[PDB]
Amino acid sequence: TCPFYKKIPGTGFTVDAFQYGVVEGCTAYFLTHFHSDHYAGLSKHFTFPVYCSEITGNLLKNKLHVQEQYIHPLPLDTECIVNGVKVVLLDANHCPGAVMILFYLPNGTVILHTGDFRADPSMERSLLADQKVHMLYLDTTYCSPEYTFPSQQEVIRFAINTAFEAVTLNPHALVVCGTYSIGKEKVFLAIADVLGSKVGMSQEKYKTLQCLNIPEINSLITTDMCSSLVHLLPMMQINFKGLQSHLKKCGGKYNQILAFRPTGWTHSNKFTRIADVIPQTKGNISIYGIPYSEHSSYLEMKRFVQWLKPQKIIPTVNVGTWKSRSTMEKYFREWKLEAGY
């Protein structure tokens, strides 16, 4: 049965609620982004209206074979009417095609559902600025002050400089980047660009990337591994055994691997600066864990909420334990008292 925090009151709407069968009284199902915990349940047999971004709708059609007649893509930053309710989709600064949803309820309440997001000051100048929000359904993934990480830009600087140094020192080194879902494409695209290479990957991953409207993509990715010195692999294969095996397969073209695992947060964040990150090494294989996050840090989340001044907050992440719920509720009260709303 669908949890309350996926239901939008005063409407026929649910958000990211595809794994509960037919939800009683749901007339339209919204999907914020194409990550499996959120799309779980969709397939070619789905026959209710799905509302989403253009990019999300490309993925639904091509990867999950959802029939076109039930996909309703909406433009961003545009007031649209769905089953008689005004809605707007806003960029969530998460993975490609990820949105936040503004609902303008018939009785005058305004509700923001962030989906998954990485809050940014740039959001303070979208259509959010123009009216009051009463209820906020918030991505609280990293809602605790221990969760600090660098900007995306510092993390990509570190990766580019690391890769460029290594390959310039040894032109027979291969760079490998791990992936398991869409998101974090900048990691592998920036490394390939500095090295003057295309990124090589499986046919299934190339298919996924071709749905994302990234400019000049035919110029940056390929399925011809032999012509590429930056290879993408499943995140599970980013370990010494899996990488030793891969290196075998390249037929003596390469004699060293430098690999990157983009994680979100890891406890080496509470001690070490990005400048100071070092790899795990075994033989001719090294592995860097880099803290490339597509969710808000604690400080970014705090700033956004203190800007928005919602009357009520509903967390959507970490809701399963009383200890987490109590922690989060204590931070929301602090933020409210400090800012004065």
To Ni ion, the closest distance from the beta carbon of 33 in angstroms equals 6
Binding part of the chain for Ni ion, among 34-42, 71-79, 102-110, 285-293 by CB under 5 A, reads 34-42
Site residues (CB under 5 A) for Ni ion, limited to 233-272: none
Touching Ni ion, residues 92-151 (CB under 5 A) = 116
Pick between residue 205 and residue 295 the one whose CB is nearest to Ni ion.
295
Residue 35 found at the interface with Ni ion (CB under 5 A): yes
CA 268 to chain centre: 22
Q: Binding to Ni ion (CB under 5 A): which residues in 36-65?
A: none
Distance CA 144, CA 302 (A): 10
Strand partners, 217: none
Write down the least CB distance from residue 91 to Ni ion, Å.
14
Please report, as a single letter, which amino acid is at residue 168: T
Residue 34 exposure: Cα atoms within 13 Å on the Cβ side: 25
In the complex, the smallest distance separating the C-beta of residue 55 from Ni ion, rounded to whole angstroms, is 14
Integer angstrom CA distances of residue 73 from 50, 51, 88: 8, 6, 12
Question: Mask 314-333, x = binds Ni ion (CB under 5 A)?
Answer: --------------------
Nearest-angstrom CA–CA distance, 293 and 94:
9
Sheet holding 230-234, edge to edge: 221-222, 199-200, 230-234, 173-179, 256-263, 285-291, 280-282
Taking CA 175 as the corner, what is the angle to CA 170 and CA 149, rounded to the nearest 5 degrees?
115
State the minimum distance, in angstroms, from the CB of residue 94 to Ni ion.
Answer: 6
Q: Cα separation of 177 and 197, whole Å?
A: 14
Nearest approach in angstroms of CB 87 to Ni ion is: 20
Asked if residues 242 and 257 have their Cβ atoms less than 8 Å apart, the reply is: no
Closest CA to 4 of 32, 23, 28, 30: 23
The residues in 279-308 that bind Ni ion, with binding defined as CB under 5 A, are none
Residue 35 or 231 with smaller CB distance to Ni ion: 35
Strand ranges (E), 108-198:
110-113, 135-138, 173-179
Closest to Ni ion by CB, 35 vs 113, is 35
- Nearest CB to Ni ion, comparing residues 114 and 228: 114
Count of residues touching Ni ion (by CB under 5 A): 2
Nearer to Ni ion, 116 or 300 (CB): 116
**What one-character DSSP code corresponds to residue 283?**
T
Q: Which is nearer to Ni ion, 35 or 118 (CB)?
A: 35
Min. distance of Cβ 142 from Ni ion in angstroms? 13
Q: Binding segment for Ni ion among 27-35, 202-210, 269-277, 299-307 (CB under 5 A)?
A: 27-35
- Beta bridge partners, 40, equal none
Part of the chain binding Ni ion (CB under 5 A), chosen from 31-39, 45-53, 252-260, 297-305: 31-39
For residues 117 and 254, which CB has a smaller minimum distance to Ni ion in the complex? 117
The residues with which 287 forms a beta bridge, in sequence order, are 259, 280
Query: Which is nearer to Ni ion, 35 or 198 (by Cβ)?
Result: 35
Interface with Ni ion by CB under 5 A: which residues?
Answer: 35, 116
